From a paper:
Among a series of truncated proteins, the ΔN90-PGAM5 construct harboring the catalytic domain readily crystallized, enabling high-resolution structure determination to 1.70 Å. The last two strands formed an antiparallel arrangement, projecting the C-terminal tail in proximity to the active site situated on top of the β-sheet core. The two molecules of PGAM5 in the crystallographic asymmetric unit demonstrated a dimeric arrangement. Both subunits associated by aligning the β-sheet cores along the non-crystallographic two-fold symmetry with their active sites located at distal sites. Intermolecular interactions were exclusively constrained to the C-terminal portions, where the α4-β5 loop, β6 strand, and C-terminal tail from one molecule packed against the corresponding region in the other protomer. Unlike the α4-β5 loop and β6 strand, the contribution of the C-terminal tails to dimeric intersubunit contacts was limited to only one hydrogen bond between the β6 D277 and the tail residue G279, prompting us to investigate the role of this region regarding the stability of the dimer. Consistently, the deletion of the C-terminal tail (ΔC-tail) almost completely abolished the association of this construct with full-length protein, an ability that was highly maintained in the other truncated variants retaining the C-terminal tail. These results therefore suggested that the C-terminal tail played an important stabilizing role in the dimeric assembly, which was also supported by the dissociation constant (KD) of ∼0.48 μM determined for the construct “d” (residues 90–289) by AUC equilibrium sedimentation experiments. As expected, the catalytic domain alone (ΔN90) lacked an ability to form large assemblies, and existed as a dimer in solution even at high protein concentration.
PGAM5 is a mitochondrial membrane protein that functions as an atypical Ser/Thr phosphatase and is a regulator of oxidative stress response, necroptosis, and autophagy. Phosphoglycerate mutase family member 5 (PGAM5) is a mitochondrial membrane protein that belongs to the phosphoglycerate mutase (PGAM) branch of the histidine acid phosphatase superfamily, known also as two-histidine phosphatase (2H-phosphatase). Despite harboring a canonical RHGE catalytic motif, PGAM5 lacks a typical phosphotransferase and/or phosphohydrolase activity for small metabolites, and displays instead a phosphatase function specific for Ser/Thr and, potentially, histidine residues (Takeda et al., 2009, Panda et al., 2016). Overall, the catalytic domain of PGAM5 adopted a classical phosphoglycerate mutase-like fold with the canonical three-layer sandwich topology, which featured a six-stranded β sheet flanked on both sides by α helices with the first four parallel strands arranged in an alternated β/α manner.
Residue numbers in the entry:
A (entry chain B): 88 to 179, 191 to 289
B (entry chain A): 88 to 180, 195 to 289
The structure:
Amino acid sequence: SMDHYKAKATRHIFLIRHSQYHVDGSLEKDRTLTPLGREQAELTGLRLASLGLKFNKIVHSSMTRAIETTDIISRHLPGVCKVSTDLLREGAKPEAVQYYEDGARIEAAFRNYIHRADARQEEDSYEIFICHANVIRYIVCRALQFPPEGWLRLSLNNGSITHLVIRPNGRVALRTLGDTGFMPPDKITRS
Amino acid sequence: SMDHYKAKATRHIFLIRHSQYHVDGSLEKDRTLTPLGREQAELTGLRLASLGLKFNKIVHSSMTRAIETTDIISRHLPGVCKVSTDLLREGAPVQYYEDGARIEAAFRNYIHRADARQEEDSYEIFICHANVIRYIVCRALQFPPEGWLRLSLNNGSITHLVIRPNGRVALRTLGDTGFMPPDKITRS
Ligand SMILES: [Cl-]
Ligand SMILES: [Cl-]
């Protein structure tokens, strides 16, 4: 649950991990989805469209993998606005500096997108965020008031759907985590 | 992760919540699956069988709703041994102290206990109720057990924990019913 949180209606937060991608592309623009990754994103779009929900917004990382996952999923959700954000990117001892930076960035995403309620919300909301495993796991554990170690102990599939429900008083329920039940096992990957 | 734990191989723990059942049934023998519940169990059985895994065991609650969910799922898993246990039974929706103690006992007997005989990676199914599944997840991951009620598990859902030999635990999915059509999904 969440301290100092007050929103006007319930929020349904769907956190989608980007699909399988070419980790070894030289430049960020080369780090596109794999053919399997494109099929994963089709399955995720099919699933989301099948829920009978009107989504308010798709917010997505500006990394190539997340833009492409979004391009595919959005075809299934005609009329839903898309917002690109650099805040949901991952940055380029190296390890410690990178973790320090990533910590700040994932907390920033939490505060900006999850803890921050919109004063202009007028009904229950259904919000899609397409991004990466660190920020998704972190948001889940942060929202549920789990320990700082905790997010590293989750492991989420490519194209997976995580559903958090946030009540106006800040009560949080995790309805599903890392759901790829809608994908055949021969399409399921972690990277 | 878990302290005082050394296993020989990795264990894949699949925690399945019983399907939808008749909550108002008078006696425990009347609290059977609803027709939709039988449908949910079939979907969960189909999903489990599709994973290409030879499951080592199916451990289930001795409650009617769990026995019935198991009956259906086991049809999809021929040859897999089944063990009934009262350790996974739930009490009513200060007797609650002993129900609490029993979920800890369950965690200890089934999850924290590794088999010295198991030298190969194992795949273990537990079919039981939302309270003990949520507790197990929190305990295995060293989350505040009071976190338990922040987790919501659909009927017939699959929750998957991975336990490495050194006791490191990963949560791979929680409350997965993505294999069920939306109109078949229930929480009670
Ligand atoms: Cl991303
Ligand atoms: Cl049960």
